[PDB]
RNA sequence: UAAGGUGAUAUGAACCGUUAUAACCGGCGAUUUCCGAAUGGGGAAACCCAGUGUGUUUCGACACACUAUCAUUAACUGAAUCCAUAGGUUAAUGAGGCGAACCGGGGGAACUGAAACAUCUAAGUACCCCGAGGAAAAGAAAUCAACCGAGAUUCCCCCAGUAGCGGCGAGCGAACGGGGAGCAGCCCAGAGCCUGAAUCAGUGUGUGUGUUAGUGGAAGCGUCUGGAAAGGCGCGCGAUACAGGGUGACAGCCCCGUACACAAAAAUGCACAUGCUGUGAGCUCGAUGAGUAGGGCGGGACACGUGGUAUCCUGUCUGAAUAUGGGGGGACCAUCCUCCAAGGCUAAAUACUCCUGACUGACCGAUAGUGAACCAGUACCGUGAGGGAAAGGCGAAAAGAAC
RNA sequence: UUUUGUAUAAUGGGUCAGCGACUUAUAUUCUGUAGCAAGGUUAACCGAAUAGGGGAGCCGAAGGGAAACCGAGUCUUAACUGGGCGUUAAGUUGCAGGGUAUAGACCCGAAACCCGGUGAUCUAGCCAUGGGCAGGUUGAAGGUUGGGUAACACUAACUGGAGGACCGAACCGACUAAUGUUGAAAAAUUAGCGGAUGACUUGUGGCUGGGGGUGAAAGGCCAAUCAAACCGGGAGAUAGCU
RNA sequence: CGAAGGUGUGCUGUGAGGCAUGCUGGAGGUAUCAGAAGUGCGAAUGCUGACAUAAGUAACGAUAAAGCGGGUGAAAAGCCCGCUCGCCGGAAGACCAAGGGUUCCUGUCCAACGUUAAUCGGGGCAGGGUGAGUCGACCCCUAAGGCGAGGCCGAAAGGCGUAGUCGAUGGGAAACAGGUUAAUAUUCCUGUACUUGGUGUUACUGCGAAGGGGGGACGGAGAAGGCUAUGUUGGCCGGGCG
RNA sequence: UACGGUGCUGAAGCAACAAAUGCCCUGCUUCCAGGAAAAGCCUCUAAGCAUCAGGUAACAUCAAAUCGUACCCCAAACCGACACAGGUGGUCAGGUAGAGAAUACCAAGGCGCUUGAGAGAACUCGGGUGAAGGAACUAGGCAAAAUGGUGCCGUAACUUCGGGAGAAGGCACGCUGAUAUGUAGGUGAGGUCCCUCGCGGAUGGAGCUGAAAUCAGUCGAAGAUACCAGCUGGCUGCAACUGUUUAUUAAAAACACAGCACUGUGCAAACACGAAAGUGGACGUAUACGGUGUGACGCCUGCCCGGUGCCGGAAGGUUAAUU
RNA sequence: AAUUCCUUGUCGGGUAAGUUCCGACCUGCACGAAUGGCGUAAUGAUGGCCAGGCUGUCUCCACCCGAGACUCAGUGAAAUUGAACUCGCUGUGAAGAUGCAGUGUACCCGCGGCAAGACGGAAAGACCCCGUGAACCUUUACUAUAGCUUGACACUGAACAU
RNA sequence: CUUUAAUGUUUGAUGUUCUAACGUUGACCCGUAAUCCGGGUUGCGGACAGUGUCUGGUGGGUAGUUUGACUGGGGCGGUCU
RNA sequence: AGGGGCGUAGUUCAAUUGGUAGAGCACCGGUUUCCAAAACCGGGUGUUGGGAGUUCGAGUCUCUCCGCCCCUGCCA
């Protein structure tokens, strides 16, 4: 039975990619928080 | 935005009161109006977004004097 | 999780 | 600075050095791919696609450089429209973003308390936004006092849980004055007479004192137990060094250090002196911040919730005097004191610690202490924001067990 | 543990080990204790600095009264023989402790409220661009040729191929029953069932964001969560309850 | 010459306890009197770790089905080979996109992983393997939509939007057959083609836009007709005489 | 030769018929709900060149980069915590029977589903058959059983004249031969004429393919023999209907629905989303749009304006800021 | 009657027997005309009722084929659990006893079965109540408020007539 | 003082006509390769409309809350000094 | 059941609500009409459900008791 996750690289990058996150300050605040936290993978982009 | 180009008046916030003194947040905005002022030196009409209080000071101060301050202010009339 | 068995006595 | 050395797991290999071009440490440079403010354009970040110009040639191409936007300034051109103006094209500068807390400003809750709940409280807190600095902000009386006087601002202790505020409930909560920390005053609203005066900012030029590598640094043997002595038992010695650490069990004299005494080619901080570049000191005569103060209306800020409510800020509507004049002295008036708003600048005492160094602890000792003593913001979970672990100890030496 | 009352067939616990709940700051009152004593004591700060300095202040030795005032008295009243409150009686500063107060205030636990973000890769609707629907029936309008009319109308035959038409696979739906219920599967399988050229279905993108969306409307759906999503913050909300 | 710790034993106090010792261990421990507390645990459906219980019970994942001989091996119901049997065959076959990321091929190994064993494996280890002018992507072009110079608006943040610039799921130049590797192939090889640009030569010569026009360029349903893929039969060729 | 393989050689390699959902077809016909864009491409000239440049044509020549390319891809490799009876878009579409991509059996090809071996109890699950009765069961014919195809005959109330209707009900179905040794039909060679001449036209009928019907015979209990494949009728409530809905206990009489009516709305429309700008409404204009209720169609929709709303009136009473 | 309490109203039809169904009656507790009324062909995984066919639905189950269950080998869970040396009866008792009293019975221990009890397991009861709990929703509850609307003033002027 | 007739004044009430604020989601020109915007020209409207402050009305459109206790369970009834 | 309301002329309703009960129709009597009615004139009617209390005095005020109405009898 179809579940909630249907993979799509183009959709995934357009929704949570580095350029999508950094386009707005609110997403840029996510990057600031993840940089402050020390995340190994800042964004979802490969 | 709602900013007077002469006096610099901008929206301010306050409270709606009531007979029960209940306070609700509100905004007070200036009585801004777009007017075409005749500047004699350039023999031209220059349009300014001014408040009603700003209109009174233009007569008192002169059209040229206020614009001189505006150029100092860099408001880009 | 579960769903409260409607074995309910009303 | 050096007789050793090619980072770690992590051996090995191939080598480099040994008295000074091994290595290591520090100063100053060089290089510094791609993404990212990202800035040639685009983009699903680490990719795609150019333009211009210079210079290369093997005539297939190739190598550099430049080309974002905005602000400011200056040129050149350039509409309707005659001048103009808007606009346009160049060229110079500057800004973009990131970062812990502290700071100023623009916005601004609710849970909660009131044993409910509207005013009120929570609270101008949380949070969002803007801006700046090493501090910020504030700041040189239209201030207070009370008929005596004080003399900018900030911070601390009192005053005092006082005076007051308050469904006069919950609760909120000064000031005057005093004791301290630290103190610093100036400029414009204008012209002269003097004159480059003081002072400040740039910079070089030295000195002094730091910072960024370092140098030297005292003094013990014997015996006993024991795998091993730093322990025991003897007898010494140093101490401006008995702070600590390491060494086969507890070391002042084994090692590293420590106390002291020293050190800089180069860069840099700080301070003094000094030289240039600006900067104006002093004197006289003037001038004395107007859509402002004040007022009406609606709010806000003052401990002060409209109350009899001064004072401050103003969204709205009005609107003076102006030194022969105004402001304040908690409604208001008179008298009397005190000050001169509607222009600015200003160090110190104050707040904070992402970061650097040293040191300290009746702080923790692996379920504790940072989530993390371990390749931890990792593994893992979640579309995402985000959440988030477990896991330390062989022995003195791996001698890690040939056969 | 909670109760008038539990062997109770009331709650709790499979066991062990580790961890796990009356603390802290400030102020205030009381007790104890120590010092000084009608006095006691300093705070900030200074300071080679736990000393010393600093008495700014605080408490006490005098109260009565709303207050002005008076004072071992005072208030009340015109006045008290009065009456109320006072007048012989040591306090103060440390330390420890018992209370109280403000803070999370002994610990654990809400459903929620508010703020800022993340989500329409699921699903709902919509937008753009593509795809899919075996086969077999029924035989509308219209058309032609006749018959009929003055002309129509009308009628017959033959052509035609209309439909949110029919039967029925793919596809899509999910009505009944059995199984399954620690599932093969956090909603399915088996045998039947409805739609199946359409208000159909589907692929790939896009858009609408939380008091908001979207909804052929069930309070449905909005990432296994919906009468107000998720994440973080206020936040150790609050919890007269257990 | 054996500290703490642990594990026995003995003694002792009214109790919480204390003392001493045997063994374990192998380096710390600490009198006394004071001082400070993260100062005492059985419970909180407490938290974390470890270990029981049910229990050698349920289950071992579609009732499509296996059997034998041989091989390898320490070991074969499960691997390899062979011969049968059975299952799918609009799929349970073949090729892709999306998505995954080496699972592909070869060698080697059986701890863990595989619901058993395993010599086997999508497990562990080491090598190898993905070859394009024509296939895709990139590129040119635009849809929905996004972003958006200036601009307009808005406390700030920001919102909308013009010129523009992105954005396929659509529109745009061209390759087929054969062969070959353990694993790749319209990519390699063989054979035979084709396309778009650049340069040069020769001849003939109106070129030219961010502009105009044409074209690109488009629905649903239905009806046949002409065909091919493909299948069948015959012929032909080769083999067979059961 | 290493079961692979490697090397060499290598015959025929045709016709007819059938035939797509593929191609012609981006066509044709028809309908109303009236069915992208841009660029490449073709062409036209402006300004700016017209000796040049540039264009056209023919040769020669260069260049075609970069990235992806294994493998899985209805699954043990993706989404489901699993080597999970689930989900996942496109392309390909063999033979016999059949209308068919249903179904049954097979080809190519791929598998036997990663615990087995015994035993043959109760009971449970998935199935088979059943004397006699035939719904007595049970809330209820739940389930099961039964019906089932083609052709033909025949077919009621009622009706909106379309339906109801596959109404019901019944008959014939195999095989062989004959009609007719392989028919009707379809396809169509050779041959023979004609051509301003070709992938031609007209004749011509060989050869293939091939129903359907009738008659005769024959076998069985049974000939639509398996699989496949409607149970039917009568009365009545509700909703007109196809459709939609509580993903995951409710598919309905609920919602929607065409239709009807009321009402708002004159276009800078009302309204809605937005502090605003603006956008939708709509590039529409009352034969339009929004809102509300009702819900095809047929016959119809009566009385009340007191209450509450709404609309109209504006004289008077009352009444804010302001003065 | 999808409405009717009394109620299984009364009568008729259907059945051997019909609280349902169908037809009427009207006494409409408490129908009623676009919150539409009445009819209505067709349609319906629509509700109720009846008939035929049909049958293991049943009288009343029997046998058979498979998959489990059982035995062996291998791998190997789970919910639960204060501790157990865990009998019946009658009585008592936080008032329904394996555990108390009395009395009876019972050698120790598996395996296959059935579920009466262990107030069995699951989940701090959804019903009820309570808290000066929470949330959504309604309205002529209260207080506000967006929006809409009124006027004054400002943006905002001139002239004339009454 | 009343009655007041006229007289200027000061405020308003309408009505009419203007343009010059303001409006234009009318036309035209330019910025400009532009259905935005701005500027220019012109027309129309016009001291209205519209907006600001203040103010009356309306306002489940949207919020924050209240909506008692005793009670042989609660509600209903009754009760509260 | 429980709670509210009601009982007035012959039938339907006013009542005053502490001191003396009306209206409509019906009925009766008299006119009018050939006669009935319609119309006109005139008029008599009541224990105010029953009882027991208040009070100097009750249909009225209080409480039971009959009869008749209207409401409730709800959550598991
Ligand atoms: Mg770039
Ligand atoms: Mg409260
Ligand atoms: Mg600095
Ligand atoms: Mg040294
Ligand atoms: Mg001044
Ligand atoms: Mg003023
Ligand atoms: Mg004020
Ligand atoms: Mg007062
Ligand atoms: Mg007050
Ligand atoms: Mg005041
Ligand atoms: Mg440890
Ligand atoms: Mg910890
Ligand atoms: Mg830890
Ligand atoms: Mg551990
Ligand atoms: Mg007891
Ligand atoms: Mg118990
Ligand atoms: Mg328990
Ligand atoms: Mg004391
Ligand atoms: Mg001291
Ligand atoms: Mg003093
Ligand atoms: Mg006295
Ligand atoms: Mg205390
Ligand atoms: Mg406490
Ligand atoms: Mg249909
Ligand atoms: Mg069908
Ligand atoms: Mg149908
Ligand atoms: Mg959900
Ligand atoms: Mg909410
Ligand atoms: Mg949260
Ligand atoms: Mg808080
Ligand atoms: Mg809490
Ligand atoms: Mg210790
Ligand atoms: Mg011992
Ligand atoms: Mg040791
Ligand atoms: Mg503790
Ligand atoms: Mg367990
Ligand atoms: Mg076993
Ligand atoms: Mg058992
Ligand atoms: Mg068993
Ligand atoms: Mg078993
Ligand atoms: Mg299996
Ligand atoms: Mg074998
Ligand atoms: Mg691997
Ligand atoms: Mg493999
Ligand atoms: Mg093994
Ligand atoms: Mg492998
Ligand atoms: Mg190639
Ligand atoms: Mg390539
Ligand atoms: Mg191609
Ligand atoms: Mg911009
Ligand atoms: Mg935009
Ligand atoms: Mg593009
Ligand atoms: Mg594409
Ligand atoms: Mg392959
Ligand atoms: Mg391949
Ligand atoms: Mg062919
Ligand atoms: Mg057409
Ligand atoms: Mg699978
Ligand atoms: Mg799962
Ligand atoms: Mg998985
Ligand atoms: Mg699918
Ligand atoms: Mg099939
Ligand atoms: Mg088969
Ligand atoms: Mg059996
Ligand atoms: Mg059964
Ligand atoms: Mg059967
Ligand atoms: Mg048989
Ligand atoms: Mg039978
Ligand atoms: Mg029989
Ligand atoms: Mg029966
Ligand atoms: Mg029976
Ligand atoms: Mg049935
Ligand atoms: Mg059957
Ligand atoms: Mg029928
Ligand atoms: Mg009925
Ligand atoms: Mg229906
Ligand atoms: Mg339907
Ligand atoms: Mg459901
Ligand atoms: Mg659905
Ligand atoms: Mg259902
Ligand atoms: Mg309806
Ligand atoms: Mg009326
Ligand atoms: Mg009305
Ligand atoms: Mg009934
Ligand atoms: Mg009867
Ligand atoms: Mg009936
Ligand atoms: Mg009705
Ligand atoms: Mg009506
Ligand atoms: Mg109606
Ligand atoms: Mg029915
Ligand atoms: Mg029957
Ligand atoms: Mg027992
Ligand atoms: Mg008993
Ligand atoms: Mg018993
Ligand atoms: Mg047993
Ligand atoms: Mg049983
Ligand atoms: Mg049982
Ligand atoms: Mg239980
Ligand atoms: Mg409970
Ligand atoms: Mg509950
Ligand atoms: Mg209560
Ligand atoms: Mg409300
Ligand atoms: Mg509240
Ligand atoms: Mg109560
Ligand atoms: Mg209820």
Q: Find the domain containing B59 and state its range.
A: 1-77
Alpha carbons A18 and A11: distance in angstroms, whole number: 13
Contact at 8 Å (CB) between B47 and B35? yes
Alpha carbons A38 and A20: distance in angstroms, whole number: 20
Instruction: Measure A7 CA to G239 C1' (Å).
Output: 45
Alpha carbons B15 and C1: distance in angstroms, whole number: 49
Tokens 């993979």 belong to A7
HEC assignment per residue over chain B:
CCCCCCCCCCCEEEEECCCCCCCEEEEECCCEEEEEEEECCCCEEEEEEEEHHHHHHHHHHCHHHHHHHHHHHCCCC
Tokens linked to A14: 């357009």
Tokens linked to A43: 């964004």
Domain boundaries, chain A: 1-46
Residue B54, classed as helix, strand or coil, is: helix
The distance from CA B14 to its chain's CA centroid, rounded to whole angstroms, is 20
Show which subunits contact C, needing at least 3 CB pairs below 8 angstroms.
none
Contact at 8 Å (CB) between B9 and B29? no
Resolution of the structure, angstroms? 3.5
The distance from CA B49 to its chain's CA centroid, rounded to whole angstroms, is 6
Strand I nucleotides within 7 Å of a protein CB: 21-23, 38-40, 50-54
DSSP label of B55: H
Instruction: Measure B32 CA to H6 C1' (Å).
Output: 79
Contact at 8 Å (CB) between B20 and B4? no
Its CATH class, for the domain covering A1-46, is mainly alpha
Nucleotide of closest approach to B33 (CA, C1')? H155
Structural determination approach: cryo-EM
Q: What is the DSSP string of A3-44?
A: -S----HHHHHHHHSHHHHHHSHHHHHHHHHHHHHT-SS-SS
Instruction: Measure B20 CA to D117 C1' (Å).
Output: 14
Number of domains within chain B: 1
**What is the sign of the dihedral through the CA atoms of A19, A23, A26 and A28?**
positive
Closest by CA position to B7, among listed B68, B64, B58: B58
Closest by CA position to B7, among listed B70, B62, B68: B70
Tokens linked to A21: 């996150």
């Amino acid at each position: 039975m179809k579940r909630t996750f249907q993979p799509s690289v183009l959709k995934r990058n357009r929704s949570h990619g580095f350029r999508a996150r950094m386009a707005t300050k609110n997403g840029r605040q996510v990057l600031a928080r993840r940089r402050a936290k020390g995340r190994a993978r800042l964004t979802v982009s490969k | 935005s709602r900013v007077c180009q002469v006096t610099g008046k901008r929206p301010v916030t306050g409270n709606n009161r009531s007979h029960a003194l209940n306070a609700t947040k509100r905004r007070f905005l200036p009585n801004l109006h777009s007017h075409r002022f005749w500047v004699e030196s350039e023999k031209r009409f220059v349009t300014l977004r001014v408040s009603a209080k700003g209109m009174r000071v233009i007569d008192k101060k002169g059209i040229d004097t206020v614009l001189a301050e505006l150029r100092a202010r860099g408001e880009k009339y | 999780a579960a769903a409260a068995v409607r074995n309910a006595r009303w």
